[PDB]
Each structure stands twice: as structure tokens, then as C-alpha cells.
Amino acid sequence: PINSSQWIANGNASIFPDKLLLTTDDYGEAGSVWYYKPVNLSEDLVVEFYAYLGDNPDGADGITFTLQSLGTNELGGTGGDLGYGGISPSVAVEVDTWLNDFDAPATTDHIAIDVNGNINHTYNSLTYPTPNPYDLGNVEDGREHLIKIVWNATTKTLQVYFDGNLSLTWNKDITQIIGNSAYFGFTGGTGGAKNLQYVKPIYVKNG
Ligand SMILES: [Ca+2]
Ligand SMILES: [Mn+2]
Secondary structure (H helix, E strand, O other), X not given: OOOHHHEEEEEOOEEOOOOEEEEOOOOOOEEEEEEOOOEEOOOOEEEEEEEEOOOOOOOOOEEEEEXXXXXXXXXXXXXXXXXXXXXXXXXXXEEEOOOOHHHOOOOOOEEXXXXXXXXXXXXXXXXXXXXXXXXXXXXXXXXXXXEEEEEEOOOXXXXXXXXXXXXXXXXXXXXXXXXXXXXXXXXXXXXXOOOOEEEEEEEXXXX
């Protein structure tokens, strides 16, 4: 059900017939998988996918959905960088499964909006600004979670749903950050703690 010709894998990521593997259950990884064709952010974008964050609550580090206007070879840092940190220009929705000192004010596994490769929630809230991270409780439960991301190119808003629940919204024009065209894809990282991490894209609608 995945067409491997449409996806470009970097680092420790791999393309499988039914999933995009971001990290294996091993230390120090970074992986990214980009879709081969950019999207037009002067039109609406809806992305729905299942996310698997692992079966170890004491594991790490998490995944992103990322929009970025560089191209299909990009790979961000390992560990708490989630395979994303350092990528710019970009907007990411992270599902973060390890609390770093820079993760305040998160207190559990959390979902957050990051900008231009910055994974520090207080810096982003002071600079852009981005919303506070939203605590999910433990999502390293060995289950697939449904994530939906909605960009509205008329209101200039982003919504994020997790297991059917509205979790984050934002009113920044992301096209003023990354431009009107972007590649989309997924990243993950592991560090001194680890988890098997993957996504299963379900639906992408642009306009
Ligand atoms: Ca983290
Ligand atoms: Mn975080």
C-alpha cells in the first residue's frame, strides 16, 4: 500500500510495503522519510497518519511530521532532536516521548509545534511564538495513534488532532516561515533511550 518510488528515506529510516520506519529499537538513531512531490501551501492541507511510538514508556525520543522547503535529503539530529532538529526553514508537529531539560513546560509525552529546527519549547514560545506543548500522558503503549494535521490557507491556521481529540491550534501564517511550497514527511530519533518508531500515512489532501 506504500509506493516506495514516492518516498525518500535518510539515515536509519526505511520504507516498508505498509509503513515508513523512522527508527528501529536501537540507540543513537536519526531517520527521515520525505514525500517526493512538494505541496502548495497557498491551498489547504490535511494529513492523517497513524503513529507508533514504541512499547517502552522509559524509551525515547519521538517523531515529527515536518513541512520544510529544502528537499528530500534533509535529516536532523539524533536523540532529542527527533531526526528534525536543525532543519530550516520548517514547521514541525512533534510527538515527543522523552523529557529533555529544554522540553519545559511539558511534563509527559507531548505534542508540540516547532519552527525552523528549534526543539526548545520556551525559546519557540518567546520567538515565533508557538503554543505550549500539550501533554498526552504515556503514548509508548505499543498502540498506533491517529494524528490529523489541518492547515487552512484562508485563515492561516494549523490544527493538530491526536486520537480524535483537538490537541493544538495555531494562528501563524506558516507560508511566511517556509514559503508557499514545501516538502512534507516524517522524522524520528533515538538517543541514550530508544523505541521502534514508525508511521502509516492514511490520507493527504492539498486543495
Ligand atoms: Ca524530548
Ligand atoms: Mn518536546
